Write a protein that binds this ligand. Sequence first.
Ligand SMILES: *[C@@H]1O[C@H](CO)[C@@H](O[C@@H]2O[C@H](CO)[C@@H](O)[C@H](O)[C@H]2NC(C)=O)[C@H](O)[C@H]1NC(C)=O
Ligand SMILES: *[C@@H]1O[C@H](CO)[C@@H](O)[C@H](O)[C@H]1NC(C)=O
Ligand SMILES: *[C@@H]1O[C@H](CO)[C@@H](O)[C@H](O)[C@H]1NC(C)=O
Ligand SMILES: *[C@@H]1O[C@H](CO)[C@@H](O)[C@H](O)[C@H]1NC(C)=O
Ligand SMILES: *[C@@H]1O[C@H](CO)[C@@H](O)[C@H](O)[C@H]1NC(C)=O
Ligand SMILES: *[C@@H]1O[C@H](CO)[C@@H](O)[C@H](O)[C@H]1NC(C)=O
Ligand SMILES: *[C@@H]1O[C@H](CO)[C@@H](O)[C@H](O)[C@H]1NC(C)=O
Lengths: 360, 49, 256
Amino acid sequence: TLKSFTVEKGIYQTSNFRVQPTESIVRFPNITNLCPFHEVFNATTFASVYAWNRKRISNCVADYSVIYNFAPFFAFKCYGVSPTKLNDLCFTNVYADSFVIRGNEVSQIAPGQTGNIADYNYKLPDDFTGCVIAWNSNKLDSKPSGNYNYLYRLFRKSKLKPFERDISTEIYQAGNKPCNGVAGPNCYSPLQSYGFRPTYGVGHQPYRVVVLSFELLHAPATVCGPKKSTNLVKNKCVNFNFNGLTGTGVLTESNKKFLPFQQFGRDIADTTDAVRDPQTLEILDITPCSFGGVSVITPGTNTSNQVAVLYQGVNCTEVNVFQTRAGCLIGAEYVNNSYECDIPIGAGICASYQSIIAYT
Amino acid sequence: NYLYRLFRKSKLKPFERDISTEIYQAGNKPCNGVAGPNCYSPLQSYGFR
Amino acid sequence: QCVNLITRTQSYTNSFTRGVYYPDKVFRSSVLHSTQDLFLPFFSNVTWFHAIHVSRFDNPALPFNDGVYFASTEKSNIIRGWIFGTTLDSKTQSLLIVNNATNVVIKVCEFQFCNDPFLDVMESEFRVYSSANNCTFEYVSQPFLMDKNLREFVFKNIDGYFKIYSKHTPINLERDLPQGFSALEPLVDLPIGINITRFQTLLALHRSYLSGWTAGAAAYYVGYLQPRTFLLKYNENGTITDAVDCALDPLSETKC
Ligand SMILES: *[C@@H]1O[C@H](CO)[C@@H](O[C@@H]2O[C@H](CO)[C@@H](O)[C@H](O)[C@H]2NC(C)=O)[C@H](O)[C@H]1NC(C)=O
Ligand SMILES: *[C@@H]1O[C@H](CO)[C@@H](O)[C@H](O)[C@H]1NC(C)=O
Ligand SMILES: *[C@@H]1O[C@H](CO)[C@@H](O)[C@H](O)[C@H]1NC(C)=O
Ligand SMILES: *[C@@H]1O[C@H](CO)[C@@H](O)[C@H](O)[C@H]1NC(C)=O
Ligand SMILES: *[C@@H]1O[C@H](CO)[C@@H](O)[C@H](O)[C@H]1NC(C)=O
Ligand SMILES: *[C@@H]1O[C@H](CO)[C@@H](O)[C@H](O)[C@H]1NC(C)=O
Ligand SMILES: *[C@@H]1O[C@H](CO)[C@@H](O)[C@H](O)[C@H]1NC(C)=O
């Protein structure tokens, strides 16, 4: 500290004692109001790809783990975001699009792809941020007679724009002559039936597809992953993260009666002195961990190399140990004799070298 | 021919290269070196056209 | 089914020291805290509106400015909520706050609002709006118009959030804007994120069954918040018991 190899006799304030943080405590509100993924990925009836079902998702917690464990998935391809980071990401809106297609066309549900499904039934934009999930649905959607309730659009005048749906049943006019709204040669009804049967090849078996599209807007993002309760440890110096307010301190019991709308608490000098726990509605007195001014009492290096340490303001139980009003003095022995002051300690206590003695 | 590391357990340090072609565990279930559910390959190729 | 039924008259009164709210969610005890925020100035000009329906369009839409202080001495059933937005038609988003006997429904959709919107009593919203499309927000909670009693609200639209503050202060024969301090507790911080420039009060009308609606009257006070610096007194229990407006008079300026 003194930037010299020889130290003159005296007391030098050299360092600051600190109580190191031991554990990390993160307290967040109870997980609840989970997003209804269980009503999207487990529905009694799915929808035809032409009339694909869209559910808007907002104002809820997104627990993607239930989506992960719902079924074995033929594809869980995620475009523009990794699947794992989703829980730690918060999005403004999540759109869940549900439909049934044949297995061969699952590859078509991706950005930049072409086919009957991509051009005429469901289109994803080139810059799409989201995930595509598909799983086999033979038990739910296959009948031996043939399931004729799943339809697709085979004929359309122009390609679909991204996130567009056409429900029109208008007869597709492929020829110069007007159709007149009655089926006729060169006039074909656009919606064809997916005649699913249990004995079809894997390419043609029915597959249920849910497309999750995540969008961020200027509005505050209200769909974010789970919040970890962790656990609450009191009476020790732990790094606390309470509802995004971070710090480091002991959390003692509080006698302060907060009003119901208040969450934190502040000192006269605008320093946090209290907090309300989100998990349990209790008030805790945040008190920062102990600190002290480490002062080194030493005679000249010409005479001796013994030193004594004064922890300024620190009681002796919180760190040849003597308790002074200045702080805790370690390394000097109190003598009931009184001499003149050699090295000033404070509060009437002075130190001298004879070993190092401390006296009034 | 150009691949990127989609998955890794931790972030890399400056000027560090990772070429380990080991499987990544994305879920609670261990993967045991075989791909399948919630087990994905870390290296994915770019669709350059 | 938009019908013009409400006529409105206006007078001017004094704000006294009404309109103070808690500027944040921080517990402060036995301190003097100076904050600069959108507050209703002390002894300011507040407009008293009387809305009368007897059994032409004479109920215009009020501006919102930087936030609105609302007060009413009426019972909880006559005034049933508010409307917020810019154009108040199907082209922009709008916020509808409707209270009833059991709960409050706050809902942000693309409402095609009527010129004179009112809830008619079952309860029907066909006289409030004709259509509501592309609805993006809904929030149902316990009501804040429950049961002589002066009800005060402060609405702010700051950085995407529709901050609503409220207080229920009983009053006697004394004028509807009383003396003393009643700090407004932060009630609902709605994450809306829409543009709000105009607002209108919603009233409830009963069918007559005999002049299709029963005659009624409602009195309410509207004041406008301004960027002002206040010095609030926090007592031992964290309640704001007193405040001084720093720009009102030299004595309060010295205090601030
Ligand atoms: C008061 O408002 C609530 C909320 O809008 C009404 O309760 C809903 O009534 C509808 C009837 O269309 C039900 O489908 C909902 O399930 C109810 N929701 C809740 C949360 O209860 C209530 O009916 C209204 N009461 C009156 C008298 O108008
Ligand atoms: C999912 O579907 C199966 C099929 O019957 C049902 O048994 C199960 O309860 C469903 N789970 C949920 C969470 O809906
Ligand atoms: C949160 O969870 C705790 C512990 O289960 C419970 O006591 C409390 O009522 C819950 N709700 C709130 C709002 O704290
Ligand atoms: C309030 O405003 C009106 C017109 O805006 C004005 O005539 C009236 O004098 C004002 N009130 C006071 C107390 O000045
Ligand atoms: C609003 O509604 C119209 C028709 O109801 C629709 O064309 C438009 O895309 C909608 N916009 C949004 C943002 O939902
Ligand atoms: C809010 O609406 C008003 C009235 O139409 C308009 O003048 C103003 O520009 C709008 N603000 C924004 C940010 O769009
Ligand atoms: C504050 O709380 C205490 C303890 O409940 C109570 O006795 C006192 O009346 C309250 N008000 C004031 C102004 O101290």
